Design a protein around this nucleic acid. Structure first.
Ligand SMILES: Nc1ncnc2c1ncn2[C@@H]1O[C@H](COP(=O)(O)OP(=O)(O)O)[C@@H](O)[C@H]1O
Ligand SMILES: Nc1ncnc2c1ncn2[C@@H]1O[C@H](COP(=O)(O)OP(=O)(O)O)[C@@H](O)[C@H]1O
Ligand SMILES: [K+]
Ligand SMILES: [Mg+2]
Ligand SMILES: [Mg+2]
Lengths: 366, 368
DNA sequence: TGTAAATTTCCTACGTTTCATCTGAAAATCTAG
DNA sequence: AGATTTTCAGATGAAACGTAGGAAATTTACACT
């Protein structure tokens, strides 16, 4: 059925990145100075998720690393996967050939050791910070200024910032924006047609003979194209599709398998999410279930009911009015602020996900 | 009724029923280490009492026998270290390894952790060495624990590592580096009723005495355990109770088992508190007469004073509590009250009444 | 001089609850020829 | 009708809360030279 699914994991990195021709150009052009050992311009990359951001960059740096071969360091660090100011600065201080103890140091004195690692480093270095959203979200903006001031307060390194929403550029009050928007690329979501190309070039390395109909790929593409031109969707949707036509022990793939995949993927997206939900958030959701196109009011009502049947003190309606919205973002519920003259101003609330996946997992925790 | 089997199975059992594949696949990977200089790392996952520990001890233990006999193994050093038993700390763990591998003169404190890895290379400088890490889920949960393993697995001194964790999700606790450079994970599926009934029938065979155990009753226990549970340590030690008790005539009936069960669930709590770091006990009593943590800490600082002993900081106290909750002894509540000045930590003593009895008993026996 | 781990010392930001202010079109009332 | 006045049912804002918990600082115990 397959001969390497690995050609479909969001790890593997391809020979060419179709349709990211301008994005690659613009970068390796705006990084050129590295060849004569001269600090390039700081880049700031935004675009949705699965638009190529992480891909392009990790690939352009692997190309310049060889083209130049020149002394030149780059460190790719995912702020999401790090989740702690210590860890970020602990690798940064490992990549410069510096050793830091696991404990004993503290942020402040950590930047100190870092300013030393730079002024002692004779190799121009590019720092990649992926998904900064994450590590500015539930941490401080600080790391930026303090990293800005760092190459600045002793004469050099260069940065590449990759985030997801336009709204993030707004958080850069200080020179943080002035010194990062030096170069500012955008990664538009892919076209369905674009997404077909990308899928076919990776499919021919993955599957077997005519194990995979053209027809499968065009819809696999057009499905994900409809949900924010996401390249990672188009790929999972396909891989799984294959894995599914695998456990159903046959050596082909059917349109029926892809729709199958799609749902299966939700299940796990949501099951994960729902599992890591506050006992109280699980609770508000539960009510919305037993009600199944209702109003914030009726929800709080059936909320108090379960706290009662359970012996677990309720919560303010005020907390529930937002705990709702919160489940909106996660994409489990859908709540809109309607305006109805004498029927008041509610949140019309309803289920985005299936009802079963919402309970089986729900029970998986209690 | 012939106890030797029931506390040292590795001495009786010359094989492990329903784990043959696990055992072979290992001795293979090892022979390929010795004859091929090819490194390998594995992660044994599984619920408790599925033979994780037992298997390992057996690999290790049989290889001790093998280098004696073979000779081409003559030159292979083994270290078996229990990340929980030692401290859980990297420093603690690294010290132990460098203990056996090097020779055994080794500091526990004061040294830079790298100079443990430096020490290990020197003690196995070409000469092949194998590592076992029972409950490595402790080491990993601590700062730099996976950042240790990575420098082990992927370092120079040709060393093959075996990691047996007790927490299954132990990967989500592991850094990409580590997980990436990690070998295959080997999962011990819990036993079913049939598997258990055979295992028991083996133990029954060795330890016990013909007649005293029929077939239905072995079937009985396996039925009991197996059904969502798994766990063989209970299954074996469960027989033991109903065994102890049935010294009557004796025939061993459904009774002997039932009691053996209550006998086991409640007797657990006893030593579960008996062996509880000194201040923990004092803390624990604090809680039984006040669920309010800040309030408990006061009657804590009292008992310490009364036993001429420095009371610990409330911070360290709230932890010992939080930590008692990870133990399943108490249950933390946390009540939040907006404009009404909320945020108070609370703690419930599971049985309150049972625990107290055990606490009293423990303090009292430790005076005579 | 040093390091790793355990505990103490510092300090606030966290998840709410309470109090207070807004919202916006439906419907029920009024308006005047 | 058209033009108002309510009237509903919850949204949206803001303050007050006081310690639980995270991060720095100190202590503990050593090691090496
Ligand atoms: N133009 C492209 N060609 C091939 N693969 C792509 C392309 N754009 C995205 N991908 C794929 O999407 C997956 C993850 O996408 P990624 O570029 O990391 O998105 P982002 O970094 O924007 O979240 C990777 O496996 C990568 O192969
Ligand atoms: N397959 C088996 N054969 C014989 N005895 C077993 C078997 N599985 C478990 N036991 C007994 O039950 C105990 C529990 O297994 P253990 O080695 O503790 O695994 P884990 O480390 O996962 O708890 C063992 O020490 C052993 O005495
Ligand atoms: K204090
Ligand atoms: Mg990415
Ligand atoms: Mg074990």
């Amino acid at each position: 059925i397959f001969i390497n699914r690995e050609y479909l994991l969001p790890d593997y990195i391809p020979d060419e990145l179709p349709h990211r021709e301008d994005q690659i150009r613009k970068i390796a052009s705006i990084l050129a100075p590295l060849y004569r050992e001269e600090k390039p311009n700081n880049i700031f990359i935004y675009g949705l998720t699965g638009t190529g951001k992480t891909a392009v960059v990790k690939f352009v740096l692997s190309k310049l690393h060889k083209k130049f071969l020149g002394k030149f360091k780059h460190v790719y660090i995912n702020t999401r996967q790090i989740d702690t100011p210590y860890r970020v600065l602990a690798d940064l201080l490992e990549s410069l050939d510096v050793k830091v103890p696991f404990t004993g140091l503290s942020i402040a004195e950590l930047y100190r050791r870092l300013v030393k690692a730079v002024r002692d480093y004779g190799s121009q270095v590019v720092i990649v910070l992926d998904e900064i959203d994450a590590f500015v979200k539930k941490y401080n903006d600080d790391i930026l200024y303090k990293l800005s001031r760092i190459n600045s307060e002793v004469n050099k390194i260069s940065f590449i910032g990759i985030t997801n929403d336009v709204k993030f550029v707004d958080l850069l009050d200080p020179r943080v924006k002035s010194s990062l928007s030096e170069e500012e690329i955008i990664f538009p979501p892919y076209n369905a047609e674009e997404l077909e190309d990308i899928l076919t070039k990776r499919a021919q390395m993955a599957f077997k003979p005519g194990v995979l109909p053209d027809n499968v790929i065009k819809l696999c593409a057009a499905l994900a194209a409809r949900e924010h031109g996401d390249a990672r969707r188009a790929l999972d949707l396909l891989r799984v599709s294959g894995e599914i036509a695998e456990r159903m022990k046959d050596t082909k793939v059917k349109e029926e398998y892809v729709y199958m995949a799609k749902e299966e993927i939700e299940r796990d997206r949501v099951r994960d999410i729902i599992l890591t939900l506050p006992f109280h958030s699980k609770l508000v959701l539960m009510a919305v279930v037993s009600i199944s196109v209702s109003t914030t009011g009726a929800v709080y009502e059936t909320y108090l009911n379960i706290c009662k049947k359970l012996g677990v003190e309720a919560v303010t309606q005020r907390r529930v009015s937002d705990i709702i919205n919160e489940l909106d973002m996660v994409g489990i519920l859908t709540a809109k602020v309607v305006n109805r003259g004498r029927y008041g101003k509610t949140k019309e609330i309803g289920l985005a996900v299936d009802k079963n996946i919402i309970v089986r997992s729900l029970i998986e925790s209690d | 009724k012939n106890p030797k089997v029931f506390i040292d199975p590795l001495s009786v059992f010359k094989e492990i029923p329903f784990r043959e594949d696990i055992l072979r696949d290992a001795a293979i990977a090892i022979r390929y280490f010795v004859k091929n200089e090819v490194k390998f790392s594995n992660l044994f996952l599984g619920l408790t009492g599925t033979g994780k520990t037992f298997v390992s001890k057996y690999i290790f233990n049989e290889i001790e026998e093998v280098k004696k006999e073979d000779e081409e193994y003559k030159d292979v050093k083994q270290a078996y270290v229990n990340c929980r038993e030692v401290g859980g700390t990297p420093q603690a763990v690294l010290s132990s390894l460098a203990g056996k591998l090097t020779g055994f003169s080794v500091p526990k404190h004061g040294i830079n952790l790298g100079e443990y890895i430096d020490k290990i290379k020197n003690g196995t400088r070409n000469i092949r060495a194998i590592i076992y890490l029972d409950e490595v889920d402790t080491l990993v949960k601590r700062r730099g624990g996976d950042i240790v393993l990575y420098q082990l697995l992927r370092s120079d001194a040709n060393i093959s590592v075996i990691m047996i964790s007790n927490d299954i999700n132990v990967r989500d606790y592991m850094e990409p580096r580590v997980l990436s450079s990690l070998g295959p994970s080997v999962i011990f599926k819990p036993y079913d009723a049939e598997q258990l009934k055979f295992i028991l029938s083996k133990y029954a065979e060795y330890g016990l005495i013909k007649g005293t155990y029929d077939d239905e009753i072995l079937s009985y226990i396996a039925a009991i355990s197996a059904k969502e549970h798994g766990d063989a340590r209970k299954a074996v030690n469960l027989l033991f109770r109903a065994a102890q008790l049935a010294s009557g005539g004796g025939i061993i009936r459904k009774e002997h088992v039932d009691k053996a069960i209550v006998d086991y669930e409640q007797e657990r709590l006893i030593e579960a508190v008996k062996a509880l770091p000194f201040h923990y006990k004092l803390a624990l009593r604090s809680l039984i007469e006040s669920e309010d943590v800040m309030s408990a800490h006061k009657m804590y600082t009292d008992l310490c004073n009364k036993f001429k002993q420095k009371p610990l900081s409330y911070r360290r106290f709230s932890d010992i509590i939080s930590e008692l909750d990870m133990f399943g002894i108490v249950k933390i509540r946390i009540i939040n009250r907006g404009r009404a000045g909320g945020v108070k930590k609370y703690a419930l003593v599971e049985d309150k009444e049972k625990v107290l009895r055990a606490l009293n008993e423990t303090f009292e026996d430790s005076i005579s």
